Design a binder for this molecule. Structure first.
Ligand code: ATP
Ligand code: ATP
Ligand code: A1BD4
Ligand code: CA
Ligand code: ZN
Ligand code: ZN
Lengths: 694, 146, 49, 48
């Protein structure tokens, strides 16, 4: 593996048909027999690992202990028609058969899988690199074909990305994707987060901040994968282990708890449909259920208690599952604003930014970057701004001890961490906790869950308060959430048009009060009339209440103007009221809703069209890649896959800096400097080597 | 074929075969596709309408019960909101089909201690149910056309 | 897919599809690794014929 | 119509240079090319 790593280092910054690449190909040809021997050593054991798991092999497996004889192995393995005589003999020799010629094939298959994995992967990387940089050497396809099984086995783990390299050229990078990273990426919640992020950027984002947003999303997703890892499942100690198990159980099943709460609310309301009010006990009145079964009354009480419990558990699961991500994101943005902007060193927001004003409470706290990974942010800010703004002033602002920095660099102290609750008491950072609780209580999802819990509690004071939890169907169902977004899209326009309707109805009220008062008698009686327009407030209420809801306007309700000195004036009054209020303004409301529908639909279509017509990374359209068949699909799955950039970021984070290669160090330094010039913009490997490849 | 067979049991079952005009005529098939395109959205908005009408039913049952006497007689009243099921049926049946909402059907709240509460009740019912949700249904159809 | 299992071993599986040698091809392709007799039982073939 | 007018104006301003008319795609070959072109090279405020 070390030798192959040296070879790969020789291939750094190597152009297509490069001298070093062709020299390496010639060297491999010079040792063709040995390279074939190595590739054969790998492929026989790779094939054995899957053969021993085959039903055809298990048919020959007959010993109850789980073993197989050498002769049985011989007749089973040549039945697969995959190895030759010498290869089967070699496998028999390598098998540690006992004096009874019994073979433990379970351990035999797994003996060399782990030891050979690293060298196998590096051989796959080397052959892939040579094949993609010397594409017209007939001697190399023989090695590629002999290494077909190795390449196929390592295909899911061989990640490749393209960067703008150290030499002002597009370079292709090969690295290793781990099984855990790929599996965590393929989780449905992470896929949904990816879809949401893609929609946000492609819809309401620009080209300038796109790569910044993508990297921020990658970091957030890495933190989410860590959260999933911790919450995943395979006297103080016992209570602690049970507590963390219970909290992880709540976190894993948060959405099932939400669905259960919804179902419980539905059941409670279905029972509530049977309520009946009677003056007789089951001058005030009694409310009671009216059913013959007799179990609905206890069932309602049980369901109410269970619904309250489920709501409380949902609150707990949320604060164990999403609150860490909220805090992580806020801490990260605050740290970057401190370092790269000096938000509280240079600009000092002008009291109109409630978020920035609230973040001041956390600056000097001992545990400010609790979730954000960078614990040295205060050090970096000090080193960056202390010379110009004062080391002591910066230290006071960030709550640092200047004397302790030296000793922390000096050595490490190992104190006694006593596992006592009394000692745990003052170990709490009260100011940081206040800041965190403010951040949480300003969060929309937490606020919704808290309102849900509060309404559940009020449901015990009065069971009809459980009707409010039926509104949870709006966010529980994505389709209903979209339909309601189709109303909330133009909410300000709807409010403004309602206010305009109020104003125009007020003008009509003024006219009616001044001139058409005799027509607002809504009393069939002759001696006590009920005049609706003898007061401005009463007339305005009458208009806004009956005229707007009337199909033909106010003229439907007020008296007939036939045979009056004001007949024409009043018919103009009624007709204009009908046209402006009933027709035009209500039609405006419907049109605002309908245009919101159309706008949302075309947003979805535009996002899909952009994703299917342009590369998310380089921006080159699908038309260029379609010159070669399936070119865009291969470009987005192998060349510029964004999942591969995310995996590369995780790979850099996990890998040791002293083990970083030249390209990896380049990208890592650019990442830490927050410079996104390594992302290919408007150029790709195929474009750069058009003449050579074609 | 089954409906044709049932038509011999009762000739009025032959009316069902008139629906064959939907697939026999391409234009009508397209017009009906203009409805079936957003069928899930229409079902969801109908369910939402049911939920909001249920909330209004709950409010009416708890507070505005005296206004649901639909009997002109003086000694035997027909109270429509003395049971939750009856009140919910009354709302979903008459309030949705009424042009001005439930306030068109229920009694006049003039000169009552709950006048303003009831006018807010009626106006919000008219705006949310009669205007907004029905407009959403029409818009789903029209967007399917487009 | 669960319903298509009933037709695999039937003598007249490709009645309308033109390829009458599909069972032969599937056997030649997968019998070595998964068992000629098992594939023949799955597809209802007589290896002797 | 009013909504699509606003969208069309925004799209034209974000996709073409107001002065030379060359589209953002040409300037995007160099990263941030259109932004730098409209802030330094062909800024209309600079012509004013
Ligand atoms: N740079 C890019 N990286 C990844 N995908 C890209 C890129 N540029 C464009 N795309 C598009 O992103 C889309 C992502 O695929 P999508 O998430 O819809 O998969 P899918 O159809 O659900 O697949 P599966 O069946 O495997 O679940 C692809 O259709 C691809 O064309
Ligand atoms: N020749 C040009 N000169 C100036 N702007 C141009 C030109 N061609 C296109 N534009 C576009 O004009 C837009 C003008 O920016 P705009 O007035 O929207 O700024 P803004 O987002 O409100 O900025 P700020 O945050 O600084 O107030 C830019 O987005 C730019 O892409
Ligand atoms: O997203 C990240 N970027 C850099 N370093 C990190 N450590 N842990 C997570 C990290
Ligand atoms: Ca090194
Ligand atoms: Zn690309
Ligand atoms: Zn220009």
């Amino acid at each position: 593996k070390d030798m192959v790593v040296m070879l790969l280092s020789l291939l750094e910054g190597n152009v297509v048909n490069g001298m070093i690449a062709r020299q390496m190909v010639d060297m491999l040809v010079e040792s063709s027999s040995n390279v074939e021997m190595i590739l054969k050593f790998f492929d026989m054991f790779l094939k054995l690992k899957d053969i021993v798991g085959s039903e055809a092999f298990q048919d020959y497996v007959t010993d109850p202990r789980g073993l197989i004889s050498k002769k049985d192995f011989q007749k089973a393995m040549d039945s697969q028609k995959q190895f030759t005589g010498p290869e089967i003999q070699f496998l028999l020799s390598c098998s540690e058969a006992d004096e009874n010629e019994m073979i433990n094939f379970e351990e035999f298959a797994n003996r060399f899988q782990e030891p050979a994995r690293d060298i196998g992967f590096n051989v796959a990387v080397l052959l892939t690199n040579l094949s993609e940089h010397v594409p017209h050497d007939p001697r190399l396809r023989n090695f590629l074909e002999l290494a077909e099984s190795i390449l196929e086995y390592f295909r899911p783990y061989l990640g490749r990305i393209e960067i703008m390299g150290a030499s002002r050229r597009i370079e292709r990078i090969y690295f290793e994707i781990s099984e855990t990273n790929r599996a965590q990426w393929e989780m449905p919640q992470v896929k949904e987060s990816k879809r949401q992020f893609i929609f946000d950027v492609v819809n309401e984002g620009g080209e300038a901040e796109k790569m910044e947003l993508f990297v921020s999303f990658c970091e957030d997703t890495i933190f989410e994968m860590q959260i999933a890892a911790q919450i995943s499942e395979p006297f103080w100690g016992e209570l602690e282990v049970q507590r963390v198990k219970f909290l992880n159980y709540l976190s894993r099943n948060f959405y099932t708890l939400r669905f259960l709460a919804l179902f419980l609310a539905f059941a409670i309301n279905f029972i509530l449909l049977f309520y009946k009010v009677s003056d007789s006990p089951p001058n005030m009145v009694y409310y009671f259920l009216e059913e013959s079964t007799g179990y609905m009354e206890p069932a309602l009480w049980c369901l109410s208690l269970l619904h309250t419990l489920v709501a409380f558990l949902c609150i707990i699961g949320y604060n164990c599952l999403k609150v860490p991500l909220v805090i992580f994101k806020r801490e990260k943005e605050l740290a970057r604003k401190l370092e790269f902007d000096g938000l509280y060193i240079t600009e000092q927001p002008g009291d109109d930014d409630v978020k920035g004003q609230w973040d001041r409470l956390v600056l000097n706290t001992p545990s400010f970057p609790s979730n954000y990974w960078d614990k040295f942010v205060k050090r970096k800010v000090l080193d960056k701004h202390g010379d110009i703004f004062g080391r002591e002033r910066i230290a006071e602002l960030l709550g640092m001890d200047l004397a302790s920095l030296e000793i922390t660099a000096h050595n490490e102290r190992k104190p006694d961490p006593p596992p006592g609750l009394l000692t745990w008491l003052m170990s709490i950072d009260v100011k940081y906790q206040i800041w965190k609780f403010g951040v949480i209580f300003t969060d929309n999802s937490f606020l919704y869950l808290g309102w849900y819990m509060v309404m559940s509690l009020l449901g015990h004071y009065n069971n009809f308060f459980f009707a409010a939890h039926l509104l949870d169907i709006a966010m529980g169902v994505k389709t209903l959430r979209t339909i309601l977004s189709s109303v909330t899209h133009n909410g300000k326009q709807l409010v403004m048009t309602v206010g305009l309707l109020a104003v125009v109805v007020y003008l009509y009220t003024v006219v009616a009060f001044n001139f058409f008062r005799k027509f607002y008698n809504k009393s069939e009686d002759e001696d006590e009339p009920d005049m609706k327009c003898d007061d401005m407030m009463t007339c305005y209420l009458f208009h806004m209440y009956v005229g707007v809801r009337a199909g033909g306007g106010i003229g439907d309700e007020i008296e007939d103007p036939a045979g009056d000195e004001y007949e024409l004036y009043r018919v103009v009054f009624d007709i204009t009221f009908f046209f402006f209020v009933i027709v035009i303004l209500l039609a405006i409301i419907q049109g605002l809703i309908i245009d919101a529908f159309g706008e949302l639909r075309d947003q979805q279509e535009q996002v899909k069209e952009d994703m299917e017509t342009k590369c998310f990374i380089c921006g080159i359209g699908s038309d260029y890649f379609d010159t070669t068949p399936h070119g865009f699909e291969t470009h987005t799955l192998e060349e510029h896959n964004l999942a591969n950039y995310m995996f590369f970021l995780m790979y850099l984070i996990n890998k040791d800096e002293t083990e970083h290669t030249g390209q990896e160090s380049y990208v890592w330094k650019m990442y830490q400097e927050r410079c996104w010039d390594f992302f290919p913009a408007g150029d790709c490997f195929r474009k750069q080597y058009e003449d050579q490849l074609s």
